[PDB]
Amino acid sequence: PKESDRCGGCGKFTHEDKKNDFQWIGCDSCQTWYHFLCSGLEQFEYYLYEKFFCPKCVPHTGHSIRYKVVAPHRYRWYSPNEKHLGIEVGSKTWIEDFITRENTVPSPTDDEVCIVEDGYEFRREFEKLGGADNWGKVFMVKDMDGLNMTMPKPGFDLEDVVKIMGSDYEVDTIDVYNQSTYSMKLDTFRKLFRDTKNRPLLYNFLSLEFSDNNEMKEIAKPPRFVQEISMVNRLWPDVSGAEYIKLLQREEYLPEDQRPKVEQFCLAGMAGSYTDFHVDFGGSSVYYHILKGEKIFYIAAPTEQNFAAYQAHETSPDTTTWFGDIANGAVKRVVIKEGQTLLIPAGWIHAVLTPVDSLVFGGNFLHLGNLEMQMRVYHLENAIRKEIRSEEKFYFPNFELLHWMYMRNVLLEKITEANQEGSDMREQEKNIWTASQIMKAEMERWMDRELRLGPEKNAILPTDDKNKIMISVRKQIEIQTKIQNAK
Amino acid sequence: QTARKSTGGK
Amino acid sequence: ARTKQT
Numbered sequence: 476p477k478e479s480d481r482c483g484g485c486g487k488f489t490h491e492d493k494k495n496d497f498q499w500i501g502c503d504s505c506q507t508w509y510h511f512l513c514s515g516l517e518q519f520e521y522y523l524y525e526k527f528f529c530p531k532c533v534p535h536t537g538h539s540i541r542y543k544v545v546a547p548h549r550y551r552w553y554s555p556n557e558k559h560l561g562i563e564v565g566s567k568t569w570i571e572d573f574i575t576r577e578n579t580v581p582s583p584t585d586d587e588v589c590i591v592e593d594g595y596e597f598r599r600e601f602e603k604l605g606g607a608d609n610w611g612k613v614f615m616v617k618d619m620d621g622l623n624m625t626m627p628k629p630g631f632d633l634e635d636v637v638k639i640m641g642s643d644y645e646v647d648t649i650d651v652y653n654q655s656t657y658s659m660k661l662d663t664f665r666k667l668f669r670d671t672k673n674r675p676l677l678y679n680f681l682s683l684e685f686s687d688n689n690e691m692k693e694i695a696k697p698p699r700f701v702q703e704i705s706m707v708n709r710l711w712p713d714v715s716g717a718e719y720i721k722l723l724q725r726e727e728y729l730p731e732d733q734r735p736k737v738e739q740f741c742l743a744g745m746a747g748s749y750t751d752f753h754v755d756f757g758g759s760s761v762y763y764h765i766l767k768g769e770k771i772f773y774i775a776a777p778t779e780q781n782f783a784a785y786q787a788h789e790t791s792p793d794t795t796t797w798f799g800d801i802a803n804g805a806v807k808r809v810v811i812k813e814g815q816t817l818l819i820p821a822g823w824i825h826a827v828l829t830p831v832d833s834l835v836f837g838g839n840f841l842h843l844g845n846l847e848m849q850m851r852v853y854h855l856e857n858a859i860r861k862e863i864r865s866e867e868k869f870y871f872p873n874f875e876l877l878h879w880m881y882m883r884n885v886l887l888e889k890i891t892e893a894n895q896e897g898s899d900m901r902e903q904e905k906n907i908w909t910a911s912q913i914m915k916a917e918m919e920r921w922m923d924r925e926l927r928l929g930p931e932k933n934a935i936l937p938t939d940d941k942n943k944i945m946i947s948v949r950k951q952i953e954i955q956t957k958i959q960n961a962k
Numbered sequence: 963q964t965a966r967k968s969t970g971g972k
Numbered sequence: 973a974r975t976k977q978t
């Protein structure tokens with residue numbers, strides 16, 4: 476074809492394909508083109524450099540020259556055409572100023588957050604309120620003792636992470652001032668993190684999930700109470716031996732690549748980092764333990780008034796208004812220090828500031844006690860997703876499939892068994908019963924939608940299998956009611 | 963913009 | 973930087 480269009484390289488015309496896409500970058504010195512994945516750059520650098528300046532030139536051309544900071548109050552901090560526009564939440568200018576008025580945001584009430592000294596008190600207060608089934612307030616636990624939450628011994632830091640995970644492990648990382656996400660080698664982040672004096676840009680990753688790393692997955696685990704209620708954990712039990720065999724023998728096995736991986740995250744952020752208001756995907760609950768550093772959460776209860784304000788905030792193109800300034804005083808401030816743990820139920824809207832370099836272990840999960848609220852957040856996400864175009868990776872992996880499997884593999888069996896004896900589930904399983912109805916009703920809406928306009932992309936559950944599950948669900952449900960009407 | 967927890971499922 | 977997509 477044309478030699479000048481050859482990478483690079485690579486020395487090739489069409490790249491094999493993290494994902495190079497179909498993208499090239501050109502050397503401002505030697506003028507030869509490079510596939511992005513062949514340029515030696517990482518995704519986080521793609522937009523940074525005004526001049527580049529490939530490896531075949533750096534020893535005799537110098538390092539790439541990055542754009543000069545022209546508009547520190549804009550995500551596009553490098554664009555002179557935006558100099559005159561408004562301060563964007565949370566650009567460098569925005570965060571800088573927010574840090575100074577920050578502590579004026581009111582503290583939460585006792586009904587919003589409950590602070591406890593240790594895991595034993597948490598347990599007591601958790602049970603007073605009705606436990607996980609009736610879990611509505613956030614808890615801060617100062618000392619983790621009694622939580623049964625496996626964590627690293629301090630002295631553990633970023634260095635240990637990169638050693639365990641791998642220097643070339645790529646993690647989706649937030650460019651804080653640009654308010655965007657890019658891949659970045661763990662070793663690159665560590666270099667940048669290590670340099671505490673020279674930080675032209677701040678970085679914060681939330682999304683290093685290590686549940687598939689045989690070493691890390693043993694070092695930081697969710698509290699026991701989280702493991703006991705996790706729907707994902709119930710469906711993909713990390714069991715062995717005969718238990719696993721029984722698993723396969725019932726059609727209860729689910730592929731590892733279908734497992735939502737969100738329950739074991741490592742988060743590391745630079746001081747000055749800000750993450751803006753959001754509800755965790757799928758309306759999942761969150762555990763959040765500070766190994767090192769400090770975090771300030773700004774939180775708002777999952778009420779309809781708040782949900783309406785949030786939905787509007789998320790669908791408006793406006794970029795200059797802090798959600799707290801329009802939430803009618805719903806935003807409360809809570810500080811979490813080294814060693815302390817936050818436990819957040821479904822639906823809580825929250826932003827977070829990182830006053831100090833930090834290292835956090837956290838995780839997301841779904842549970843039956845928050846089923847309604849999880850569906851409610853799901854409707855919220857879908858409503859927002861109609862207006863704005865986002866990426867599927869920022870939403871809960873395989874949300875619907877997870878429920879099809881939970882209904883099939885868990886609830887169906889429980890209802891069937893009760894039906895086959897006595898047996899009014901309201902006695903020793905009121906919770907299981909009410910969840911079944913709630914989940915069923917939601918899934919009836921999904922079914923009708925799939926019929927009205929067809930299935931989504933390829934896989935994973937054929938429409939026919941869904942209809943067969945629903946038929947079986949309706950049957951056992953109708954039977955159990957008859958038993959409840961009789962008794 | 964796009965600064966939010968990220969997976970890829972799967 | 974100057975880039976392109978194919």
Ligand SMILES: O=C(O)CNC(=O)C(=O)O
Nearest residue numbers: 681742750755761827837
């Ligand atoms: O760590 C912060 O910057 C953001 N993290 C979250 O909001 C979370 O873990 O639910």
Ligand SMILES: [Fe+2]
Nearest residue numbers: 753754755825
């Ligand atoms: Fe969050």
Ligand SMILES: [Zn+2]
Nearest residue numbers: 482485510513
């Ligand atoms: Zn190439």
Ligand SMILES: [Zn+2]
Nearest residue numbers: 502505529532
């Ligand atoms: Zn060159």
